[PDB]
Structure to design on (743 residues):
């Protein structure tokens, strides 16, 4: 899971 | 205290349900499990609080009454009133340190705590004010609520951004993996202002919006928000901190555009989720000409595969998502067709109703 | 296995729901989270088990099919069939160690375990048999099941007595504080016999009833067949109390009152009863029942009701939950209570029907 | 709580 910010 | 009032059961029930809202199970302090009751000038006021927010209800007293105040256990008082027959007249009065409730030949004596000990939110001044339809506020909240963080250490994410700009009221919620934003015109020009309402306050505000004729009157101070709907007044402290800027989160130049039916997409994702990893919930999306293939695998070596016809032209690409994030968005959209805007397998996607730009959703992928 | 079948979604849903019933959430062995699927002679059979009981469903196959058997994860298979659109045609076949489910352009591959590894409840012989309407069995269970013990040390109470006598089938359930008994005539001369069905089995049998019900009782098992469903359970080995000994012997006090008025008065008084002990005080005299409840906060509820009463004035204590359970189960107009004294059991029943009887032991206050 | 048996 990647992060938006 | 001299406090006395007689009121019909049906005038008490919704007020009691509403003001018990801020109350959590196992209050830290006993008085927090109580409601404040006040009789003044033909009005009965009922207040519930958790020290962060409070809910007030005002009930008109047409029958004989005497002024005064006390606090009684909320759940017990509500259960007594609810348990009485339809149409019951509820006669209440104080006797020393007890509050007496009588209807017919049913009598109850509740323990009290002084009204002077009930906590109140500190005085504050409104600096922004506006009215809007309850349905408009309900739509703004339902459209984004699911994307709030729950108990993140980034406390400003465990709440909802309420922003006024021009003629519109906007809500923004994010947990750092997915974001939701919704704007609605409220037909009144506003100053530019943004505040963060705690998660629990968002749920309370949502719960005071019924199928009603009343407008919602909103007041915003530097550290508080107040919402007035009919005979209910909700006040909450605001959350400190810098909320992320949604404008900077929106994918900048999405070169890929997919359109598909919202329910067809939802049911396919819902079936594929059955065979997704229970912890990671990953599904893979494979976009090719006018087709979307969704696959899910789990540690038991099982596999779900859904093939759908969609509108898509452009490079074939494979991208992975947490299926719960996708289903949350599709459930919130509840529209005919959905538009997904993509860039590549490592970048966010923007999802919206194909027919309206009022709401937008950004979901970050899982590495493929 | 060469097992293959194609069935409409709506013919699979209730069978799947029923056979997943015995299945507990955390199986000790992976196979116990599975269903056994078998195709033989135009029939699909589906079996679910927890080693103590099993549920079998039979589905007619009108579309092409091939014989064979396998085991598949119950909850995943059910969720897939449920999640498919109304009217979907569900095509199933085996591909090595995987079971392939196909409908439209939806494709699922489930992991399997061999059918030969599926547990079977041991072979047994029926020694008592009878048929009765499924609604009659459902009523017999519904009338008494709330009085079963849950996890009492007296294992034989964590279940229900099923007893045949003359032309009646009777259920008895007790937790040692309160008892429920219900009898129904079933039109056949029956041998006198009694068995204890485990509580999990009682709940499962009740959930299968909505065709006559054929019951077979063995020395250690019970079987109920209705329509295309067959439920089998092991029995509880031990001696059940005699309800005839529990019924009040010579009650000198008789109370009658409206069921709903009694139940709402007890429900409001319960609010101010001790959260742990749930004790309420009944004071009965001069055709008036006074119900009082107090708690550790020194709070008090008092209800006064008009009742029809014969006998000396008396005060008696009860666990209000036991009384409310009885009043909730009696879905009637008036209730009759038969009492003796403050330390003896009270018998409660519908004032108009003697088919069910409830015995509640008092508490000291 | 008294016992039935």
């Amino acid at each position: 899971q990647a992060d938006l910010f | 205290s001299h406090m006395k009032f007689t009121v019909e059961r049906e005038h008490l029930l919704k007020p009691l349900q509403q003001v018990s809202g801020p109350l959590g199970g196992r209050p830290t302090l006993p008085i927090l499990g109580n409601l404040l009751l006040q009789v003044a000038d033909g009005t009965l006021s009922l207040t519930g609080t958790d020290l962060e927010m409070e809910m007030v209800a005002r009930v008109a007293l047409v029958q004989p009454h005497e002024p005064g105040a006390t606090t009684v256990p909320a759940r017990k008082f509500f259960d007594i009133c609810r348990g009485l027959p339809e149409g019951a007249e509820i006669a209440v009065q104080l006797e020393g340190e007890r509050m007496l409730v009588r209807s017919g030949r049913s009598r109850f004596s509740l323990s009290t705590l002084p009204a002077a000990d009930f906590p109140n939110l500190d005085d504050w001044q409104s600096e922004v004010e506006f009215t809007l339809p309850q349905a408009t506020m309900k739509r703004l909240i339902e459209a984004t609520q699911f994307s709030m963080a729950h108990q993140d250490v980034r406390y400003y994410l465990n709440g909802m951004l309420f922003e006024t700009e021009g003629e519109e009221l906007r809500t923004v919620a994010t947990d750092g993996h997915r974001l939701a934003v919704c704007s609605m015109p409220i037909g009144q020009s506003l100053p530019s202002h943004s505040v963060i309402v705690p998660r629990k306050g968002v749920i309370e505000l949502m719960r005071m919006l019924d199928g009603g004729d009343n407008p919602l009157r909103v007041q915003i101070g530097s550290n508080n928000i107040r919402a007035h709907v009919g005979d209910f007044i909700f006040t909450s402290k605001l959350v400190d901190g810098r909320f992320p800027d949604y404008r900077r989160v929106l994918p900048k130049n999405p070169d890929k555009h997919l359109e598909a039916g919202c329910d067809l997409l939802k049911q396919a994702f819902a079936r594929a989720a059955i065979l997704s990893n229970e912890k990671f919930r990953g599904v893979r999306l494979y976009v090719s000409e006018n087709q979307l293939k969704i696959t899910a695998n789990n540690p038991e070596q099982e596999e779900a595969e859904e093939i759908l016809d969609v509108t898509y032209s452009g490079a074939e690409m494979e991208i992975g998502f947490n299926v719960s994030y996708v289903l949350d968005v599709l459930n919130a959209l509840k529209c005919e067709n959905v538009r997904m805007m993509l860039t590549d397998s490592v970048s966010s996607v923007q999802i919206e109703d194909a027919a309206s730009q009022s709401a937008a959703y950004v979901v970050m992928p899982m590495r493929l």
User: Anything to note?
Assistant: The domain at 4-117 of chain C is CATH 3.10.150.10 (DNA Polymerase III; Chain A, domain 2). Chains C and A do not touch (no CB pair under 8 Å). The first strand of chain C starts at residue 4 and ends at 8. The radius of gyration of chain C is 25 Å.
